[PDB]
Design a protein around this ligand. Structure first.
Ligand SMILES: CCCCCCCC/C=C/CCCCCCCC(=O)O[C@@H](COC(=O)CCCCCCCCCCCCCCC)COP(=O)([O-])OCC[N+](C)(C)C
Ligand SMILES: CCCCCCCC/C=C/CCCCCCCC(=O)O[C@@H](COC(=O)CCCCCCCCCCCCCCC)COP(=O)([O-])OCC[N+](C)(C)C
Ligand SMILES: CCCCCCCC/C=C/CCCCCCCC(=O)O[C@@H](COC(=O)CCCCCCCCCCCCCCC)COP(=O)([O-])OCC[N+](C)(C)C
Ligand SMILES: CCCCCCCC/C=C\CCCCCCCC(=O)O[C@@H](COC(=O)CCCCCCCCCCCCCCC)COP(=O)([O-])OCC[N+](C)(C)C
Ligand SMILES: CCCCCCCC/C=C\CCCCCCCC(=O)O[C@@H](COC(=O)CCCCCCCCCCCCCCC)COP(=O)([O-])OCC[N+](C)(C)C
Ligand SMILES: CCCCCCCC/C=C\CCCCCCCC(=O)O[C@@H](COC(=O)CCCCCCCCCCCCCCC)COP(=O)([O-])OCC[N+](C)(C)C
Ligand SMILES: CCCCCCCC/C=C\CCCCCCCC(=O)O[C@@H](COC(=O)CCCCCCCCCCCCCCC)COP(=O)([O-])OCC[N+](C)(C)C
Ligand SMILES: CC(C)CCC[C@@H](C)[C@H]1CC[C@@H]2[C@H]3CC=C4C[C@H](OC(=O)CCC(=O)O)CC[C@]4(C)[C@@H]3CC[C@@]21C
Ligand SMILES: CC(C)CCC[C@@H](C)[C@H]1CC[C@@H]2[C@H]3CC=C4C[C@H](OC(=O)CCC(=O)O)CC[C@]4(C)[C@@H]3CC[C@@]21C
Ligand SMILES: CC(C)CCC[C@@H](C)[C@H]1CC[C@@H]2[C@H]3CC=C4C[C@H](OC(=O)CCC(=O)O)CC[C@]4(C)[C@@H]3CC[C@@]21C
Ligand SMILES: CC(C)CCC[C@@H](C)[C@H]1CC[C@@H]2[C@H]3CC=C4C[C@H](OC(=O)CCC(=O)O)CC[C@]4(C)[C@@H]3CC[C@@]21C
Ligand SMILES: CC(C)CCC[C@@H](C)[C@H]1CC[C@@H]2[C@H]3CC=C4C[C@H](OC(=O)CCC(=O)O)CC[C@]4(C)[C@@H]3CC[C@@]21C
Ligand SMILES: CC(C)CCC[C@@H](C)[C@H]1CC[C@@H]2[C@H]3CC=C4C[C@H](OC(=O)CCC(=O)O)CC[C@]4(C)[C@@H]3CC[C@@]21C
Ligand SMILES: O=c1c(-c2ccc(O)cc2)coc2cc(O)cc(O)c12
Ligand SMILES: O=c1c(-c2ccc(O)cc2)coc2cc(O)cc(O)c12
Ligand SMILES: [Zn+2]
Lengths: 612, 612
């Protein structure tokens, strides 16, 4: 916005000041004879500051003018130690520019005059940001690795580059290559930089050194969805046991992958990333066999056991609403439109028989069970929802909004029972619907979990809610029309639209065709009704048929074209929740440990397969 | 047509008159034995103007006969200066014919005898028309460039042919190459014709010469959807500022692209054309970030401000119709089928209480708001086209008609209130439905409802005008059957078909299954009722299933795959509309004026990308 306008004016007044200054211009235009005349005129203003604090060496390096960049050196050798001074390109020297532009003959002549290989481009354009378009690090050795130039990397380290150097984000030169868009070229540069880590006394192998978020180069490849570097780093963690003809028993490490409770694991960090490429890591041969192992053995059976206890809680709540205390009414019927026969009992007369004491036991099971919902989930939606992730699990999305809304409605029914307020049917009727609609979500884990089952259910609900916005204006147009047509008529003969909230609810029902069209045949209806309702019935039929076709066309686009899994991240983030809630004695750790088989303290997973 | 019938007659009349004359036949069949004999007989009629006014030299050129064409030229050299004189081929010389046929040895012999390279073939088979298979221009350079003849366009320019000659449409040779089906050969011939503009002292260059519609070759590539010539002509408008490794900062021109405020810009021409491949130019590089810049900063805020003001205007109109002046009726009910209790107040009765004065404000808001609709949208719907430019504003413009018909219905209700006419429910009922269905227009300005409203609104008028004719045939056949069956019965029990306009409305409702099938069970219905209604129920089931299968084929399959491109084409069409009507004080001009940066008085767009 205001900042994007600021970058654009900054680049235009850069080119404006390179044209209105001759030594900046000849460095750009590679006018080698124009340098000799101006520099012999008593070295005029060789300490230039252009738009981005640039000197004339920065211009000559930027446009790959090797012949013009030489003349600046013998004229004043103090320009090779000069950075750019603006906020956007802060700290960038000429050695950074020639490395990114891959100018071989220039970068030797810079090192020939002792250019610092440990400079730090701290500017706002050299920071990881979606507004920035490249993130190449902060060091010249980091710039050489990202543009894929093997010969510069061998040249820079020879002059003393530090491969252990880190950024302001803590990323070393091996963290940055995982962030690069071309994966295959970054895979060759990874093997190169590890070969120069001879260094057996640095107390840490360099591909274990964490950034300021604690992530290793292994975990960062799992978070950023870099599947090419993930499979490359996994051969460091395999161990082939035997090969019996076509069979092979491979043993995987599972130290930085499986959860230990005290530390965030790779399975959790894929979920909170919310990226589309990070879910491809869940398809990989150590991780894919781990998720299906614990969602077959502990994760799924405990999911169905918690849903069976919730079903007994809602049945116990349902019985207390059916047998709610009611007495015949005390006052007389006011209007002839008053249908009410019964009313609620007061608190003193609610409990005076032994059959009410059986109900009182059931009413206390409900309230105690409603507090437990608040005591375990008011932490959860703070932890889960706004901090890490929301709506990408099974039992997920509008489950946690609704079951919190359930337990709120039960405690409202308790208050209205105590102060003997009228209208407890209103918090109960919400709580029956809210409570039983949550049972449909536990029914989602009774499935074999295909790749396009839960996301299609989530999709169809998403299109129906978009259809309800477009049909609200169609109802409001025709309900207002139907209201003023029958506004001069007698509602004893046709009372579908007798006041305006009823006319709105009738037109909603006629749209879905769940009540019949109004007709009497013993009296003359207005003529404007018949042509309006014939227009309404054609519109409502076509809009309901186009809804079905639009759900078919949107189903095809997300199965055949969007090509996103969604089905492994749902069973991961469900299994993470049940593992933090249950104690350790009910949850054995997946894999098998060492010290009785002699491999360490590490929890290995054996995978046996057939090559064919 | 008898036009195309008359064309085929003279194509056979041409072949007859050649086959009659021995001179014309020997030119055709390349019988040079007969050529020397017919000249030594007599200097005969070598100006035999046949059916389509041609000579023997034209026939030697049409059938590619080198030896026959030469003998005509030495015997009578005055035939090279002869055009065809009919209506279908007016002005075409023999030089036009040999150039299209690419008989390049004949081109040397014709240019030796100073054949006119500036003759204009102004025939009806040379104008641009959808009934002609060719549109190659009117000039021999225009004919040579479109058949991809590099050797003849080099030959004709050397012999004094004008490159900047125009048709009777203003099209130069550069315009016509854009109108050719082979885009690849059009680009190579385009570069060759600019290389012969070395003698530029003329006020406009060739690529900056408009036709009679004012379009340049760059704009005509935009209108016709020629994306191949569009990207190649955009290289002349670019200006690369710097290159930093994989980064590139390009600076686009935006002179013939952006809305200049006076002349119809390229964004306006692509929206208001009846084509489909022009909509791919909306995804080209300078155009895509231009309209994204306008929509994020000024398009979407202004569209949602107008959307919220319109919604409050319709709620104010709705409450003035709910509280419309009604009083109890004066006279008594005539028949026992009279249901009416109330009627309209008179004008002197309608405003007596202060509750009416609150309605009097909201009725003035409604009337004033309806005049503004007829002053923003009427003085551009006649001054920018009354017929078929009007119709272009209706094809992709179905909410222009709805909001103008709304504004007339509000003003009809005003006049009937002033003259105290009875029947205001008839203009109001149209105005309530047309008022609330225009809210669906503003659904395009949202990501969540954007592509989904495309799928819901799209319906085919080929298979739905088929259904609505086949629905009306079933209704007329079965309501007439249902009428005469119950014509001898008592309508007190079953009154669904008591007179013939009601039987049409009941069978319409039974076809859509929105009222129940008539039944009593306390009385004996006729036997023909059960036979007919069972046949009617199967036919109505059949035609509903025809409508579903028709809505699943070859158009909804395309809209499901193109819903995002169609939604962005609505964003561009809205942004163009809002930029014209809003003043320049609320809409700043897009780009950056390069006046204070030494670039001329132009507005530039700076685009930065990564080339990888
Ligand atoms: C009847 C009308 C009144 C209701 C209006 C309000 C209702 C909401 C309407 C809102 C406006 C209409 C737009 C559609 C809904 C959002 C768009 C969407 O993405 O759809 C999503 C629906 O949502 C889910 O099923 C997943 C859960 C995430 C969202 C949380 C819902 C809020 C809970 C409160 C709910 C109400 C309970 C409140 C009362 C207690 C799914 O779309 P998808 O992308 O195809 O799915 C792929 C999953 N993926 C995204 C992970 C890849
Ligand atoms: C999430 C997907 C769905 C979308 C949600 C919204 C869906 C719609 C939900 C609607 C919920 C209810 C809204 C209106 C309720 C008022 C009724 C009332 O009190 O009537 C009173 C009158 O007063 C009125 O009639 C005021 C209503 C007129 C304007 C309608 C409100 C516009 C909705 C805003 C949003 C729309 C925009 C949404 C689309 C952009 C009493 O009238 P009466 O008893 O008949 O007696 C009158 C006296 N007389 C006899 C002299 C005549
Ligand atoms: C592209 C899709 C759109 C198609 C449009 C179709 C929509 C239909 C448009 C309908 C127009 C609006 C409705 C009014 C029509 C009723 C006329 C009337 O007033 O009846 C009066 C006279 O009764 C008659 O004699 C009428 C007989 C048929 C004439 C009218 C339909 C034309 C038939 C051909 C159709 C042409 C169409 C060609 C094929 C489609 C009074 O009725 P009654 O009191 O019962 O009098 C009976 C007296 N009796 C008791 C002695 C017996
Ligand atoms: C696994 C799931 C799969 C599905 C299987 C489901 C399992 C089986 C499902 C249901 C069991 C079988 C049907 C029950 C019928 C009850 C007997 C009856 O007919 O009514 C009789 C009495 O009954 C009562 O009055 C009940 C009063 C409220 C009881 C609340 C539950 C207490 C449970 C305690 C804790 C539970 C622990 C739960 C938490 C862990 C007759 O009553 P009445 O004379 O007609 O009316 C007057 C009563 N009034 C005076 C109060 C108004
Ligand atoms: C004691 C507490 C329980 C503890 C149990 C401990 C062990 C539990 C362990 C495992 C339990 C489950 C193992 C069953 C075998 C799996 C088959 C399956 O999932 O069906 C199908 C899903 O269809 C469904 O949605 C459910 C089908 C079953 C009906 C309802 C189950 C019980 C509901 C309540 C009744 C009372 C039960 C609760 C009592 C209150 C499979 O679908 P699909 O074939 O893959 O379709 C793919 C098609 N596609 C590829 C095109 C997309
Ligand atoms: C997303 C947004 C949603 C929320 C939006 C709000 C939605 C809901 C809003 C309000 C709810 C509805 C009202 C509540 C019910 C009380 C009724 C009442 O007492 O009113 C009384 C007066 O009222 C009228 O006469 C009608 C009002 C005139 C239309 C609006 C005028 C305001 C103009 C300003 C325009 C501002 C700018 C406009 C735009 C540029 C009716 O009393 P009565 O006794 O029945 O009258 C009968 C008298 N008679 C018999 C002689 C006829
Ligand atoms: C009557 C009362 C109505 C309600 C009150 C109105 C509100 C106040 C009144 C007027 C002010 C209107 C908004 C002006 C300022 C906001 C503009 C803006 O900056 O864009 C913002 C959003 O913008 C929106 O989402 C607009 C939502 C407001 C409601 C639109 C009203 C029209 C609805 C009626 C017709 C339609 C329904 C049709 C139904 C068939 C930015 O866009 P973004 O997507 O957030 O960016 C991505 C976010 N990210 C960068 C972090 C990733
Ligand atoms: C004034 C009226 C409209 C009441 C407003 C409440 C409803 C808008 C919401 C509240 C929670 C309900 C939900 C409760 C649970 C269901 C199951 C559903 O998830 C499923 O298991 C079915 C699979 C699928 O989503 O397609 C998602 C929402 C739904 C239909 C409901 C949608 C609508 C309901 C009635
Ligand atoms: C599903 C598509 C076709 C429409 C989606 C719109 C719904 C989200 C809304 C708007 C229309 C409905 C409303 C229609 C009118 C009624 C009036 C109702 O108040 C009364 O019934 C009073 C009746 C009386 O006074 O006689 C409150 C909300 C309700 C059920 C509805 C609440 C929600 C509904 C389902
Ligand atoms: C009181 C009663 C008699 C009012 C009757 C309402 C009709 C006069 C209007 C109001 C809303 C409708 C319109 C709303 C929008 C559509 C778009 C449609 O197709 C298009 O123009 C392009 C497709 C698209 O919408 O994107 C043509 C007319 C149609 C069905 C409608 C034509 C007529 C309808 C039924
Ligand atoms: C006196 C008794 C009958 C009280 C009711 C039983 C409760 C002790 C249990 C069983 C049903 C409840 C559960 C209902 C559902 C949730 C989700 C949870 O599953 C997940 O964490 C995954 C959610 C997701 O992946 O989106 C399992 C337990 C929890 C919080 C609840 C924990 C405790 C509750 C209140
Ligand atoms: C007393 C005052 C405050 C009442 C408010 C008046 C507005 C409700 C109306 C008057 C005329 C305007 C409208 C004039 C025309 C346009 C375009 C739009 O219809 C189209 O022409 C686009 C249709 C298409 O391109 O397909 C509908 C509403 C809009 C933005 C305007 C919406 C709001 C406006 C300001
Ligand atoms: C292309 C679209 C418009 C659909 C094509 C079908 C409609 C043109 C026709 C088919 C039969 C219907 C008609 C059938 C009979 C009725 C009689 C009605 O006259 C009356 O007086 C009502 C009956 C009575 O009160 O006696 C006015 C027209 C109506 C609703 C209908 C008008 C339009 C309908 C939907
Ligand atoms: O059930 C249907 C049918 C349907 C299904 C089977 C038939 O034999 C006929 C219609 C058509 O459109 C719908 C459209 C809808 O929006 C919802 C539906 O349930 C249906
Ligand atoms: O035509 C469809 C569609 C379909 C897809 C996208 C659309 O826009 C419309 C229909 C989906 O599933 C089918 C499934 C079928 O067995 C047969 C079909 O013809 C279809
Ligand atoms: Zn497809």
């Amino acid at each position: 916005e205001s900042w994007a306008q600021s970058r654009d004016e900054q680049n235009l007044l850069q080119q404006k000041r390179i044209w209105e200054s001759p030594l900046l211009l000849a460095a750009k235009d590679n006018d080698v004879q124009a340098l000799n005349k101006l520099l012999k005129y008593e070295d005029c203003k060789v300490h230039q500051r252009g738009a981005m604090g640039e000197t004339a060496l920065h211009i000559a390096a930027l446009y790959d003018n090797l012949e013009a960049a030489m003349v600046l050196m013998e004229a004043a050798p103090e320009l090779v130690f000069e950075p750019m001074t603006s906020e956007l390109y802060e700290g960038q020297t000429a050695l950074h520019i020639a490395v990114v532009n891959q100018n071989m003959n220039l970068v030797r002549a810079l090192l020939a005059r002792r250019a610092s290989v440990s400079a730090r481009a701290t500017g706002t354009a050299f920071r990881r940001s979606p507004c920035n378009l490249i993130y190449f690090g902060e060091h010249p050795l980091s710039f050489a690795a990202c543009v894929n130039s093997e010969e510069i990397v061998r040249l820079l380290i020879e002059h003393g580059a530090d491969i252990r150097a880190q950024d302001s984000l803590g990323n070393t030169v091996l963290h940055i290559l995982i962030l690069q868009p071309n994966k295959t070229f970054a895979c060759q540069m990874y093997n190169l930089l590890l070969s120069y880590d001879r260094h057996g006394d640095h107390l840490q192998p360099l591909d274990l050194v964490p950034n300021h978020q604690g992530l290793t180069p292994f975990k960062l490849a799992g978070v950023e969805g870099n599947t090419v570097m993930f499979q490359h780093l996994m051969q460091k963690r395999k161990h082939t046991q035997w090969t019996y003809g076509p069979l092979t028993s491979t043993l995987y490490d599972l130290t930085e992958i499986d959860s230990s409770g005290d530390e965030q694991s790779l399975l959790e960090l894929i979920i909170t990333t919310k990226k589309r490429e990070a879910r491809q890591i869940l398809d990989q041969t150590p991780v894919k066999e781990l998720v299906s192992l614990k969602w077959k053995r502990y994760g799924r059976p405990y999911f169905c056991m918690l849903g069976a206890i919730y079903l007994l809680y809602i049945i116990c709540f349902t019985m207390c609403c059916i047998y709610r205390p009611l007495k015949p009414r005390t006052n007389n019927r006011t209007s002839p439109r008053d249908n009410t026969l019964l009313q609620q009992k007061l608190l003193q007369e609610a409990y005076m028989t032994p059959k009410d004491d059986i109900r009182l036991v059931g009413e206390l099971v409900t309230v105690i069970g409603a507090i437990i919902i608040l005591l375990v989930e008011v932490p959860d939606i703070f932890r889960m929802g706004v901090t890490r992730f929301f709506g990408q699990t099974i039992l997920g999305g509008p489950f946690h909004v609704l079951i919190i809304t359930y337990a709120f409605m039960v405690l409202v029914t308790m208050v209205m029972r105590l102060i003997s307020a009228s209208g407890e049917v209103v918090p109960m009727s919400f709580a029956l619907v809210l409570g039983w609609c949550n049972v449909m979500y536990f029914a989602r884990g009774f499935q074999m979990l295909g790749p396009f089952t839960i996301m299609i259910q989530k999709m169809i609900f998403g299109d129906l809610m978009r259809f309800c916005w477009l049909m609200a204006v169609v109802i409001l147009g025709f309900a207002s029309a139907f209201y003023i047509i029958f506004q001069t008529e007698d509602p004893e003969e046709l009372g579908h639209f007798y006041d305006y909230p009823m006319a709105l609810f009738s037109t909603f029902e006629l749209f879905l065709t769940i009540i019949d069209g109004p007709a009497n045949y013993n009296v003359d209806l207005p003529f404007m009704y018949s042509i309006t309702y014939a227009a309404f019935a054609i519109i409502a039929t076509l809009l309901m048929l186009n809804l079905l076709i639009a759900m078919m066309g949107d189903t095809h686009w997300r199965v055949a074209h969007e090509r996103d899994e969604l089905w492994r991240a749902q069973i991961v983030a469900t299994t993470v929740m049940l593992e933090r809630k249950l104690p350790r004695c009910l949850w054995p750790r997946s894999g098998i440990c060492g010290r009785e088989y002699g491999l360490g303290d590490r929890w290995f997973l054996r995978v046996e397969d057939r090559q064919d």
